[PDB]
Design a protein around this ligand. Structure first.
Ligand code: HEM
Ligand SMILES: OC[C@H]1O[C@H](O[C@H]2[C@H](O)[C@@H](O)[C@H](OCCCCCC3CCCCC3)O[C@@H]2CO)[C@H](O)[C@@H](O)[C@@H]1O
Ligand SMILES: COC(=O)[C@H](c1ccccc1Cl)N1CCc2sccc2C1
Length: 459
């Protein structure tokens, strides 16, 4: 009645059949024996696992709603308690997404321009290093955050700013701890381990502190608010609160505002950052690729005017590189968890309503049916015989269906504009030779090795 599962022990679950190397590696080892769709016991609760493009499409697109439910991540659930855009369910999630999607769609300068602007800052910043060795971590987390900040707070912060950097520091320290092997162990046995000291308490304090600053910004916004002339996501949300003053059954209250703003930073910054970081890592290893991208820039955009999003349709090779950067990136390898909305019928099995489903986004991105060389950087994977962009059914790095990444538009806009703007202005080099670069990296999120890079100016 459930997908073929290994014989679990009570309380402990399928522990003894896991691999020590991490969940993901645990899931892929099982897939070998138990097929494309199986069941594993993470403690006392079971979860359906989906491997391969088809299984994920069959569930998330074809049974879109059935698989529209959100699961908890034990290490952050104390913070979120099922409020906010990412971790809400039912009406709470629907109303909020409907609100979020529409609102981002709008300093009165469109999302494109704010990203173009942010890119100019980065270009001005990178010149100052005047060719020095640098670890692009801090810069990349900083630019992506400014976009979210510009959407929700209605401003951006300088890179040298001390206070910005500290909240930022502890924000990304939280993720690194969420992706830790310790957070994965916590997922299995949280019910026992929440009374012990562990990384979960550090994650709890780091985030609660971020929320404090968010709250303060809400108040300051509320005190300065001009209803006739809104400025950002919060200003808007505030006016929808006043609108719904009469209704207690409404979802638009304080607690949802806070965890939503937290949610936007949680999703909007970390993955977008690591992609650029992985991208340049890859671009250091393959000079022949970057030369081509720079050549494609020289022909279409030139060495003068900055890149616009319009330019992408005319730049199929760069776009394909970015596609392949995201493919190999594999930054969310088994995805944000899902749950079923009703007792669902799937491939002849019965997934009882409320059963967690792990759509393994890694297996899709390395699917040999869709990608000739699944373990090699191959921009060809996305280029037809005429050298034009071709989409692929295995390319689902933003997942699929009703839960599809809400910021896909914004994310891709950032990748393209950031890559083309940096590379238009700087050639790249590093202490490590291309042949000696190793890419293999962690848990819920992938995090590739930290590296050092020179951003050499061009003129
Ligand atoms: C290129 C970088 C990004 C990648 C690779 C990425 C990927 C993903 C993935 C895999 C999910 C899980 C969807 C699911 O299975 O439920 C997700 C969810 C989400 N993403 Fe992103 N994302 C990126 C950037 C962004 C940005 C920039 C934003 C907004 C500023 C954003 C907003 C969201 C939200 C709100 C969710 C939760 C959706 C829901 O449960 O309703 N993401 N993203
Ligand atoms: O000492 C007071 C002065 O600083 C204020 O700037 C603020 C800012 O307005 C207030 O925005 C700030 O909070 C800012 C930090 C940005 C964190 C945003 C995200 C970063 C990464 C992801 C997590 C959160 O604290 C600073 C206060 O030190 C004031 O606005 C100034 O006018 C002033 O003279
Ligand atoms: C849609 O989900 C997220 O955006 C991620 C996410 C969840 C699970 C695995 C990978 C990722 Cl990137 N959040 C989860 C909670 C927090 S707190 C500070 C940052 C994040 C990142």
């Amino acid at each position: 009645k459930l997908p073929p599962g290994p014989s679990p022990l009570p309380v402990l679950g399928n522990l003894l059949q896991m691999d020590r190397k991490g969940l993901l590696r645990s899931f892929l080892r099982l897939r070998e024996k138990y097929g494309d769709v199986f069941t594993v016991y993470l403690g006392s609760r079971p979860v359906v696992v989906l491997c391969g493009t088809d299984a994920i499409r069959e569930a998330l697109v074809d049974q879109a709603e059935a698989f529209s439910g959100r699961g908890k991540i034990a290490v952050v659930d104390p913070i979120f308690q099922g409020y906010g855009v990412i971790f809400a369910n039912g009406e709470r999630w629907r109303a909020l997404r409907r609100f979020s999607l529409a609102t981002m769609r709008d300093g009165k300068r469109s999302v494109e321009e704010r990203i173009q602007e942010e890119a100019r800052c980065l270009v001005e910043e990178l010149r100052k290093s005047k060719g020095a060795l640098l670890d692009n971590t801090l810069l990349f987390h900083s630019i992506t955050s400014n976009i979210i900040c510009s959407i929700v707070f209605g401003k951006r912060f300088d890179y040298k700013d001390p206070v910005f950097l500290r909240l930022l520091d502890l924000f990304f320290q939280s993720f690194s701890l969420i992706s830790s092997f310790s957070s994965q162990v916590f997922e299995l046995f949280s019910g026992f381990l929440k009374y012990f000291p562990g990384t979960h308490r550090q994650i709890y304090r780091n985030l609660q502190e971020i929320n404090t600053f968010i709250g303060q910004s809400v108040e300051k916004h509320r005190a300065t608010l001009d209803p006739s002339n809104p400025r950002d996501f919060i200003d808007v949300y505030l006016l929808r609160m006043e609108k719904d003053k009469s209704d207690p059954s409404s979802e638009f209250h304080h607690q949802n505002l806070i965890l939503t703003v937290l949610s936007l930073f949680a999703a909007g910054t970390e993955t977008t950052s690591t992609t650029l970081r992985y991208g340049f890592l890859l671009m250091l290893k393959y000079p022949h690729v970057t030369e081509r991208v720079q050549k494609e820039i020289e022909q279409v955009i030139g060495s003068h005017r900055p890149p616009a999003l319009d330019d992408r349709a005319k730049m199929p090779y760069t776009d394909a590189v970015i596609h392949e950067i995201q493919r190999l990136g594999d930054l969310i390898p088994f995805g944000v968890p899902h749950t079923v909305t009703k007792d669902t019928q799937f491939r002849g099995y019965v997934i009882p309503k409320n059963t967690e489903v792990f759509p393994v986004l890694s297996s899709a991105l390395h699917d040999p049916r869709y990608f000739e060389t699944p373990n090699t950087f191959n921009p060809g994977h996305f280029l037809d015989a005429n050298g034009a962009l071709k989409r692929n059914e295995g390319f689902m790095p933003f997942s699929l269906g009703k839960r599809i990444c809400l910021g896909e538009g914004i994310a891709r806009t950032e990748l393209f504009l950031f890559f083309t703007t940096i590379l238009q202005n700087f050639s790249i080099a590093s202490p490590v030779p291309p042949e000696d670069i190793d890419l293999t990296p962690s848990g819920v999120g992938n995090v590739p090795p930290s590296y050092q890079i020179r951003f050499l100016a061009r003129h």
